[PDB]
Design a binder for this molecule. Structure first.
Ligand SMILES: [Mg+2]
Ligand SMILES: [Mg+2]
Ligand SMILES: [Mg+2]
Ligand SMILES: [Mg+2]
Ligand SMILES: [Mg+2]
Ligand SMILES: [Mg+2]
Ligand SMILES: [Mg+2]
Ligand SMILES: [Mg+2]
Ligand SMILES: [Mg+2]
Ligand SMILES: [Mg+2]
Ligand SMILES: [Mg+2]
Ligand SMILES: [Mg+2]
Ligand SMILES: [Mg+2]
Ligand SMILES: [Mg+2]
Ligand SMILES: [Mg+2]
Ligand SMILES: [Mg+2]
Ligand SMILES: [Mg+2]
Ligand SMILES: [Mg+2]
Ligand SMILES: [Mg+2]
Ligand SMILES: [Mg+2]
Ligand SMILES: [Mg+2]
Ligand SMILES: [Mg+2]
Ligand SMILES: [Mg+2]
Ligand SMILES: [Mg+2]
Ligand SMILES: [Mg+2]
Ligand SMILES: [Mg+2]
Ligand SMILES: [Mg+2]
Ligand SMILES: [Mg+2]
Ligand SMILES: [Mg+2]
Ligand SMILES: [Mg+2]
Ligand SMILES: [Mg+2]
Ligand SMILES: [Mg+2]
Ligand SMILES: [Mg+2]
Ligand SMILES: [Mg+2]
Ligand SMILES: [Mg+2]
Ligand SMILES: [Mg+2]
Ligand SMILES: [Mg+2]
Ligand SMILES: [Mg+2]
Ligand SMILES: [Mg+2]
Ligand SMILES: [Mg+2]
Lengths: 272, 44
RNA sequence: ACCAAGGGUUCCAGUCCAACGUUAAUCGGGGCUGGGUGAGUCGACCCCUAAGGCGAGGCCGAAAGGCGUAGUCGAUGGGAAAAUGGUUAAUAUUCCAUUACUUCUGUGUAAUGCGAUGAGAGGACGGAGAAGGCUAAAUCAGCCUGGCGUUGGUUGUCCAGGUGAAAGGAUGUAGGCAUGUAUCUUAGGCAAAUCCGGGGUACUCUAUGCUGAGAUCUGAAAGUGGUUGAUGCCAUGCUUCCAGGAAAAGUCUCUAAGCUUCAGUUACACAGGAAUCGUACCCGAAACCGACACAGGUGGUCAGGUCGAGUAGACCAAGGCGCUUGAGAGAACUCUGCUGAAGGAACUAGGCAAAAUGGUACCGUAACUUCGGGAGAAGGUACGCUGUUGUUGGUGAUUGAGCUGACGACAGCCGCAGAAACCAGGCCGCUGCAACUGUUUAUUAAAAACAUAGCACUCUGCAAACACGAAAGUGGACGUAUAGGGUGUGAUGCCUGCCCGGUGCUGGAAGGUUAAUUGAUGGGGUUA
RNA sequence: GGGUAAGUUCCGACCUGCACGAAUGGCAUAAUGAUGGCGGCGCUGUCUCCAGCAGAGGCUCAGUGAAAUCGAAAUCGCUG
RNA sequence: GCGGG
RNA sequence: CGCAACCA
């Protein structure tokens, strides 16, 4: 779980690290990793399009099987592994015919456990099933939105959705944001909650720890000049302005959703 | 002090070289202008 | 001292001195004439790819053009192979001698399945730390040669100089890693596979393989031992931590296709090849970047002795230099230092600057504290040389010699002073601000400014919000609400009261007002 | 009130807050700071009040040889 | 110029 | 009292 560090120096006083004794200490499965170069938040044109991005440790991308399209074949868990690209752990499945794959690890999955996919799969954490065959009230993760595309929803370290009920060709689920949504019943989900789940109790402790994760420092617009930010200027400390983004969009409460194409799939949003 | 020039021949040829000028419309207009002036060196 | 970059003949020799050289110059990086750079193994070229670039088609765009697929380029990274000695005025891992190694060709001989653009393996990789085994190197000894000292002594336990052949071949150790072998089988590997992956059996795990420094053997006038000992090597190893650590080819396995008694493959033998370009010289520099033969800047490599923790420092070696105006004099004044009676901050905006402290071991050390600190708090003692005596460690000739490390106890001797020179913290009390390490006005501001971990609010359901872009599209993110963006605050402790009238924002939609649109009415003009 | 012989600064109080005040955060806070203020021990040429000495310039000789400026100059004081 | 008082 | 029309 969480281990607090002794204050043997000022940069250690507040470092709360997450420690897991069951994670594989060793190299990732080599056929399933590829290179992942850093962007710095720069697009095609070479412009910065996302601020506060840059640096960080070199990372390989693990190829996680989000589609789980190997149905009917049982698989056994070989090990649980650190994945630098996400906040959850990953499980290395060895299928019954020798194929090795990566999946998002469920909360209680350990080495030696068995998972399966398809319509026939038993109700068991790590089993991928269409939303038709899931029992109401179940805790799911790794939920599809389009048929055949792969898990898109509830993938982060402690995520999960509630299956609230199916009516027609749409199951109604509740998301972590507090939002009630409908998803086609041919979409697949996985049983259980996502693995890591104390990822949000950690404490970085020092600035350099944030730099290791590829985050660059944030500068307040209050600290800038008027040519740089709409909050800039002023003798001394002044913020005589309704808070706003660097490009002039209001920052407290102003809603920015403008997609009209999928609004009929939202039963109840958050803030209700 | 460190001064601004700091030579490197590869970088010179990749920024201001003949093939770098010939690769765009504006660089070929540079070459046409320097031929119109009668320069003895077209490029670096 | 040697490279890269950059320079471009400055390199070497002969000759000349007008100009250039902050003076003269017979000299020169100056003038004139001539010479000089030798490669299968060094580097580049070459094969391979990263970031990025270009990009057939394609998508987008008034045009110009933009993005991008297939591909094709692009090193700062991956991919064959050489050492020792000698030689020029100037080149040498290139020339010569000796001894190697790599990879190609052919021409044969003997054996017989060869296999791709496909699949697999491998190449293939982080930080930190530690133990060991070694070796270079250094030093001493041994040996060879010479010497017998301008002044007391010096035929020795004396002085000085010289003196340890590498790559490669064989061997396969210290260490490191993997249990291996056989057989049957198989929802996987775009199709095939005898291959890889997955299953099952039997024996093995005091077993097999791979890898591997160094030693030994060989190479091959003195030319042999000890000690210390690497940052080099084993080691791309091992342990541990989290922030989780290139790619592709060369290489190996497998079959597809295609051939088939051939071709191809592999074992050996014979003969022959390995092109092209660079190679001089300069490298804290008078040759590069600074207008200069300019106190600046310039990446990597090597780096000996005494003492020393040390690549600090003092003095030296190898090597290289005396910095391209000198000669006098020895005024004020300026700069840079040294010392200074008595006093000791009275100076001054201000102890500014100077003076002072300073090492090692041991003793001792307050408030306060987030229990880690504070703290080297403060402060104090000892320290040289000579001899005597003890414990101990490491190597290991022949159990233990010789060499060598560490720690003490006594006794004496000398000086003003034993940390001897160089080197090398000043300290304490109260208080504001910012938690802290960091960052910043290149060139008058380093801070209380910025950032920060932490906190909160808010937006965002994924073709996400948001940003860039004319669009295509790209980033966000090969992420998915424990995520991502914006805003403020700023560790931590204790906390964070009241106000929704104003301006925002969010929700509501009864009513008023209200655009394009539509075109009912009414009015006019024309005249049969 | 303390500190000094003597304190517009400093520290501790008081509250009459011209015109503090709670995430443009309030009040504290160990550690940290080439941070601001004040005090002390040591130490001193900072000073009373400067003296001597060393090196480098200055000065003289030989050689080379600038610069800014400049209407023209036979370019004194005082009072007006 | 359209509604309200 | 509000909403909307303003080019001597
Ligand atoms: Mg951000
Ligand atoms: Mg500012
Ligand atoms: Mg503005
Ligand atoms: Mg103000
Ligand atoms: Mg010469
Ligand atoms: Mg001359
Ligand atoms: Mg010459
Ligand atoms: Mg393009
Ligand atoms: Mg085209
Ligand atoms: Mg290429
Ligand atoms: Mg290279
Ligand atoms: Mg030479
Ligand atoms: Mg490492
Ligand atoms: Mg004599
Ligand atoms: Mg070539
Ligand atoms: Mg040379
Ligand atoms: Mg030098
Ligand atoms: Mg200059
Ligand atoms: Mg000179
Ligand atoms: Mg210079
Ligand atoms: Mg030195
Ligand atoms: Mg005195
Ligand atoms: Mg005195
Ligand atoms: Mg005074
Ligand atoms: Mg005074
Ligand atoms: Mg001072
Ligand atoms: Mg001093
Ligand atoms: Mg600070
Ligand atoms: Mg600092
Ligand atoms: Mg700076
Ligand atoms: Mg400045
Ligand atoms: Mg400054
Ligand atoms: Mg602030
Ligand atoms: Mg705070
Ligand atoms: Mg005072
Ligand atoms: Mg305030
Ligand atoms: Mg408040
Ligand atoms: Mg506030
Ligand atoms: Mg005083
Ligand atoms: Mg006169």
């Amino acid at each position: 779980p969480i281990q607090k560090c002794k204050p043997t120096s000022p940069g250690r006083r507040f470092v709360e690290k997450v420690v897991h004794d069951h994670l594989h200490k060793g190299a990732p499965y080599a056929p399933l990793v590829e290179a992942k170069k850093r962007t710095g938040g720069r697009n095609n044109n070479g412009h910065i399009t996302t601020r506060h991005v840059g640096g960080g440790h070199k990372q390989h991308y693990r190829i996680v099987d989000f589609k789980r399209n190997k149905d009917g074949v049982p698989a056994v868990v070989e090990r649980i592994e650190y994945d630098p690209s996400r906040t959850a752990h990953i499980a290395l499945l060895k299928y019954a015919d020798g194929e090795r794959r990566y999946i998002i690890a469920p909360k209680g999955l350990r080495a030696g456990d068995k998972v399966q996919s398809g319509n026939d799969a038993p109700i068991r954490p790590g089993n991928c099933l269409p939303l038709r065959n899931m029992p109401i009230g179940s805790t799911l993760h790794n939920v599809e939105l389009k048929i055949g595309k792969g898990a898109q929803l509830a993938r982060s370290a402690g995520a999960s959705v509630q299956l609230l009920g199916r009516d027609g060709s749409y199951a109604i689920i509740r998301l972590r944001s507090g939002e009630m949504r409908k998803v086609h019943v041919e979409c697949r989900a996985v049983i259980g909650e996502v693995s890591n789940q104390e990822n949000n109790l950690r404490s970085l402790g020092k600035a350099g720890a944030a730099r290791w994760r590829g985050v660059r420092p944030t500068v307040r617009g209050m600290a800038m000049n008027p040519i740089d930010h709409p909050h800039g200027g002023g003798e001394g400390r002044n913020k005589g302005i309704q808070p706003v983004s660097p490009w002039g969009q209001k920052a407290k409460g102003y809603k920015t959703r403008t997609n009209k194409r999928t609004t009929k799939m939202i039963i109840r949003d958050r803030r209700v | 002090m460190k001064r601004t020039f700091q030579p490197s021949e590869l970088k010179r040829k990749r920024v201001h070289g003949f093939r770098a000028r010939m690769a765009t419309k504006a660089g070929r207009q540079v070459l046409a202008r320097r031929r119109a002036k009668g320069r003895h060196s077209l490029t670096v």
